[PDB]
Design a protein around this ligand. Structure first.
Ligand SMILES: NC(=O)C1=CN([C@@H]2O[C@H](COP(=O)(O)OP(=O)(O)OC[C@H]3O[C@@H](n4cnc5c(N)ncnc54)[C@H](O)[C@@H]3O)[C@@H](O)[C@H]2O)C=CC1
Ligand SMILES: NC(=O)C1=CN([C@@H]2O[C@H](COP(=O)(O)OP(=O)(O)OC[C@H]3O[C@@H](n4cnc5c(N)ncnc54)[C@H](O)[C@@H]3O)[C@@H](O)[C@H]2O)C=CC1
Lengths: 373, 367
């Protein structure tokens, strides 16, 4: 016997589904459907407050976080837990990410907050979804789909106009920054396309057995990998050493006319340096689903920046990790993490923990001293 | 062997305009002529190239009357109708710069000038297309197009586009045709962990390839359609595939399924695809092929949508004319021309569609 925790205040910050969340009940991660948690929490005597109002001065988020014991966020509409907000979150013990990537929490501040809060996410819930979105985005860019589709819809016909930037993925070199759950799954899906080579850069390598099974090669230096690739995909977390990593200087190490894909986090790239590299034709293409901040401001430059030929943009809202198949998995995973806390067992899956008991509980947010697994 | 002399070659290709000068790799254009001009002229042959192929009294219609070799390309097809073949008094060889020779009336070709040779560059485009299929499948399944439009219009609503966003993992994909393209489609889908990979073809894969790829042969086309989330069409256009994907056959697909067609436009009935999208029987349709080509400016599949404003991943006929493919089919056309002009007639058998008055392929129907 362990005594369950009692009358726990849960705050969820999710995106509004409006009428969509009634047309399609599969939109679990919405303010309407509340990850299917409400009855489950209420039957135990806990309380749930859900909001999408998270950015403005005096937001519902800012009011409710002051006495929430558990805060659920979602990367697709992230309640930013800044040092200022954590300092006001007097009751906070557990911050759960409905999805993957907890960089919208100040993790260093979380470690110094209320004796060190637990920051957990649903590891593996979104990873296939994102890896497929990567391969899709790589092909969309390489085969110059977007301007071709626009030509059709506008009632025009000019095959040369869009074939002149159309390549095959076969015989191209593809590198991944990060070979964790997503980066390894990207390479697994690119195996069948007979790329000239599959490269990776990561301070946590694949086993030799997995390198030969997939057919990929570890590059020890990031700039040396960029110089060899036709395609680069970013699949690492956002932490101090990856914030603004893809600046003008690093992008200039990519090949002229290369393709860049970023489904990881917006703030890993410098948005003005991506736009200038596309506009001068150093990049042929940029695409992905992640932005900083989110929601992306209406005038964000990567909404509309193009290569010199009028193509090269394959951006979408932050959706790959919130496909209807991913939402079923991270909704179930959030309930599992909540049960670990509310039971008083604190029997978390170790791979779900980002920070815990005042220390980083992961090796994936930078190379660290003081990592306790 | 005595070489043939002073041969009149006619090429019907697409115009590259300024594009074919920005990008010299656009070989399959009227500007760059597949890199053939000097090669032909140094042998004493002549080349006439045009993109003018549709109107009454077109350059094509004038020049085909005494052309001995006609080069066409599927991306801008000189239609060799029975009427035109009847006037092509000197025609001996029709070469397709790419793959798919259905723009030639092959039955008429067999009865023309003692049976003309119709050859194409087998294998030149097949990876290109297979990549384009998987791309199109992901674009539809993941609801990319309206999501990209939302971003470019300065809007932000994740639910609006996530409500029709699925993963390809755990879906059933079926190919109509498991030849060079359909087999390469399944080889690219293997790493996505689909629930099952199916095929329908009267020429099966070997057991060893079924086990290696991890796919299953379905004996009946309608029974395969009933089991699939996604359907891709990878067969040639011939009498038994023309209008195959009509309302009755599409109604055997699952409600909310996705249909890809990189094969040939005329294999689908365009009004029946548009109606199935309109009512939500299909979630999506996409591909690069149309009938006729150029696609009329009002073709219904330019603008047909699902009930949510998505589900259209159409492009012009480009997948087989990627810059990597053009290098391969340009080299292949030169090889086929050398077989004829040398007087050896030593064609690769797999390049032959009709020859010596007979079909030379099993892939244009069971004969
Ligand atoms: N677009 C979307 O919806 C989603 C995006 N994400 C993002 O993807 C990131 C990675 O996800 P997973 O692969 O599941 O996590 P993971 O923890 O399994 O793998 C990440 C890898 O990145 C490596 N890494 C860290 N810093 C790096 C550096 N400077 N250079 C190279 N590699 C570095 C780590 O060592 C680790 O092997 C997430 O942290 C999140 O930011 C994940 C899921 C949803
Ligand atoms: N979008 C593009 O740029 C391109 C499109 N294509 C088209 O795709 C077609 C196929 O290309 P490949 O795979 O290289 O040809 P292939 O000849 O290697 O294979 C075609 C397969 O279709 C099968 N087939 C014929 N009728 C069928 C039916 N009713 N049902 C099921 N399967 C049937 C054949 O038995 C054969 O196995 C070409 O004939 C051409 O129309 C190919 C290249 C370029």
């Amino acid at each position: 016997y362990t005594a369950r925790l009692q009358m726990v205040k849960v705050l969820a910050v999710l995106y509004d589904g409006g009428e969509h969340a009634k047309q399609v009940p599969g939109l679990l991660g919405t303010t309407e459907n509340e990850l299917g948690l409400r009855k489950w929490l209420e039957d135990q005597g806990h309380t749930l407050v859900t909001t999408s109002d998270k950015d403005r001065e005096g937001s519902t988020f800012d009011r409710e976080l002051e006495d929430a014991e558990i805060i659920i966020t979602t990367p697709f509409h992230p309640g930013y837990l800044t040092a200022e907000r954590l300092a006001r979150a007097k009751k906070l013990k557990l911050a759960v990410t409905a999805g993957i990537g907890s960089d919208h929490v100040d993790l260093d501040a979380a470690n110094k907050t209320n004796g060190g809060i637990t920051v957990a996410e649903v590891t593996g819930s979104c990873v296939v979804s994102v890896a497929e979105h990567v391969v899709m985005t790589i092909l969309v860019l390489v085969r110059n789909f977007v301007p071709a589709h626009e030509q059709i819809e506008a009632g025009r016909w000019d095959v040369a106009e869009v074939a002149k930037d159309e390549y095959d993925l076969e015989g191209k070199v593809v590198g991944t920054v990060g070979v964790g759950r997503i980066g390894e799954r990207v390479l697994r899906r690119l195996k069948g396309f007979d790329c000239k080579e599959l490269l990776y850069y990561d301070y946590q390598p694949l086993s030799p057995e997995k390198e030969k099974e997939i057919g990929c090669r570890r590059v020890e230096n990031l700039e040396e990998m960029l110089a060899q690739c036709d395609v680069v995909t970013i699949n690492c977390p956002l932490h101090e050493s990856t914030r603004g990593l893809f600046n003008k200087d690093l992008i200039s190490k990519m090949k002229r006319g290369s393709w860049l894909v970023n489904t990881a986090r917006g703030a890993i790239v410098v948005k003005e340096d991506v736009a200038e590299a596309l506009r001068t034709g150093h990049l042929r293409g940029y695409g992905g689903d992640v932005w900083f901040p989110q929601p992306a401001p209406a005038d964000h430059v990567l909404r509309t920046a193009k290569n010199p030929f009028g193509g090269g943009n394959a951006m979408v809202p932050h959706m790959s990790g919130t496909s209807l198949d991913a939402q079923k998995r991270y909704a179930e995973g959030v309930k599992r993490i909540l049960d670990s806390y509310l039971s008083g067992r604190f029997d978390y899956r170790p791979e779900d923990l980002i920070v815990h008991q005042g220390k980083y509980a992961t090796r994936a947010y930078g190379q660290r001293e003081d990592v306790k697994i």
